[PDB]
């Protein structure tokens, strides 16, 4: 009952392989810091920690296929796969956006349905909805924020929250 980075990938896999509902992916946003010389403040910034993707036009597909094999270097690429990939380079200032609001106030933010996403005022929820997601969840942990996404509409179950609680650190 005090997890470290070394089991993070296993814990993300456990969360959605064992979950009773059809979750598409899980992401862990890790806390980092950005000291601001101009004001002397040490602001929390959330960035990519790890992730686990489960899953289910011509120019776009070719653009996506070209980025994938270019990454492979150093057949279809689906909307949710792309969203997952694109997520890797996002970051969030504490209190800002879906992961940031979750962390700042130590919140569970559960957005179920297309309208909950588009009405959230969070650009990441808007983006997820564009890529076909209908449920997005952020849950604040001791070391960051766990995010879940699904192309299905999923209500908050105590079973899932029980799994989250058994797989991450809480203050």
């Amino acid at each position: 009952p005090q997890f470290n980075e070394d089991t993070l990938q296993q814990r993300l896999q456990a969360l959605i392989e064992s979950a009773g509902e059809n979750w598409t992916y899980a992401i862990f946003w890790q806390i980092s810091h950005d000291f601001d010389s101009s004001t002397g403040d040490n602001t929390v910034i959330l960035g990519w920690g790890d992730g686990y993707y489960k899953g289910e036009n011509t120019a776009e597909q070719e653009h996506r296929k070209r980025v994938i094999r270019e990454l492979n270097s150093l057949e279809e690429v689906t909307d949710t796969e792309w969203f997952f990939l694109v997520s890797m380079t996002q970051s969030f200032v504490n209190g800002v956006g879906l992961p940031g609001e979750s962390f700042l106030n130590s919140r569970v933010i559960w957005l179920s349905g297309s309208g909950a996403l588009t009405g959230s005022g969070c650009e990441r929820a808007g983006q997820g909805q564009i890529y076909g997601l209908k449920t997005m969840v952020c849950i604040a942990t001791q070391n960051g924020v766990v995010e879940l996404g699904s192309s299905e509409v999923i209500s908050q179950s105590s079973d899932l929250m029980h799994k989250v609680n058994n797989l991450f650190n809480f203050n």
Binding site: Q30, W48, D50, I68, L71, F84
Partner: peptide, 19 residues
Amino acid sequence: SVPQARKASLARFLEKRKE
């Protein structure tokens, strides 16, 4: 660090996709 965290995750995702 985030960039190697990215690389590690990217590696796994690409590897798991080939399946």
